[PDB]
């Protein structure tokens, strides 16, 4: 709590006979996007997406643009290599996904680093939390692991994940402190929707919260209900906050027996919500 | 800022 | 590709909806793979033209998500929906805006 992260997400998607692969790079501080590159957008530059990063100079934008474009070229070569390892044709569209970054404490101290790679939406290879070894998902990925071990890839990446990554994350938190060093606890309420004369949906709501992590749980007489609960994915409002809900179908007249429990880092107590007619 | 690119898979 | 995940579609407003007060209409599409997708926001069945979208990103299970959004003023009578096309769908899926979810 009061922890922070910097994360970059990359997606390369091949489109044989329709051009070079689509490449999309996104950077986030905590749950706030600050940069993007999209091969299909107008500029072919890394571009600002938060007002505090705009104050960076032309040399910052030049270097990020060159660096992001080299990530793109590597992924494009990898799309060819992995197609060979998995023995797939030149005609289908394939996907490489990559995420890496670092976490720090509320005092700016390194907590951890991570990098994970996927191929066609499944684990390919990951850097382990010790930042000195890899885990491959299958025997194709172990060929990559051998190359990366021989080339000492983890040692160069580690110096970025616990040095460069952390110091820039500390800079961005400072440059953006008015916006990024905030916690918005969820504004919660409960709604009630009959589905018949004899049953109704209780929906437990959390709105306006930041950062995005939250837990919503239904209990009946204090016994868990996780298998009869509908949960939706935590969704963005578009103003920098998030929303979520969880619902349970109940017998009309037994509403007061159910409770909804809300856990967010910005909440003094865990909240307990209950539908009471009287 | 983004990391240097790893070598090929 | 080897795996295919059907998109989960949510259609909601940025703020609690109030008739006659401008707001934002959101179509959040998540949990899908592969990434090729088409999303349109609809007003009384017609395609809204000025619609923005977020940069493609993804979850822990590698499934993709995107947000499409546009300025609107909710009324009692106007029907809003989101239309999504994806390889996992037999036809394009239309999800209607409902103030209660």
Numbering used by the authors:
A (entry chain A): 0 to 277
B (entry chain C): 1 to 9
C (entry chain B): 19 to 119
Sentences from the paper on this structure:
MHC class I complexes are formed between human leukocyte antigen (HLA) proteins, β2-microglobulin, and a peptide, typically 8–10 amino acids in length, derived from an intracellular protein. The peptide-binding domain is formed between two α-helices, with an eight-stranded β-sheet forming the base. β2-Microglobulin is a single domain protein with a typical Ig-like fold and binds alongside the “stalk” to further support the HLA peptide-binding domain. Peptide binding is mediated by two anchoring residues, the second (P2) and C-terminal amino acids of the peptide, which bind in pockets “B” and “F”, respectively, and anchor the rest of the peptide. To confirm the binding of these peptides to HLA-A3 and the suitability for antibody generation, we determined the structures of both the WT and mutant β-catenin peptide-bound HLA-A3 (WT/mutant pHLA-A3).
The WT β-catenin peptide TTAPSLSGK (amino acids 41–49; hereafter “WT peptide”) has been previously shown to be presented on human B cells using MS, likely in HLA-A3 (39, 40). The structure of the WT pHLA-A3 was determined to 2.2 Å, and that of the mutant pHLA-A3 was determined to 2.45 Å. Both WT and mutant pHLA-A3 exhibit the canonical fold consistent with previously published structures of HLA-A3, with an RMSD of 0.483 Å between them. The peptides bind in the cleft between the α1 and α2 helices, differing in only a single amino acid residue, located at the P5 position. The peptides are anchored in the HLA-A3 structure by binding of threonine at P2 and lysine at P9. In the WT pHLA-A3 structure, the serine at P5 orients laterally, making it accessible to antibody binding.
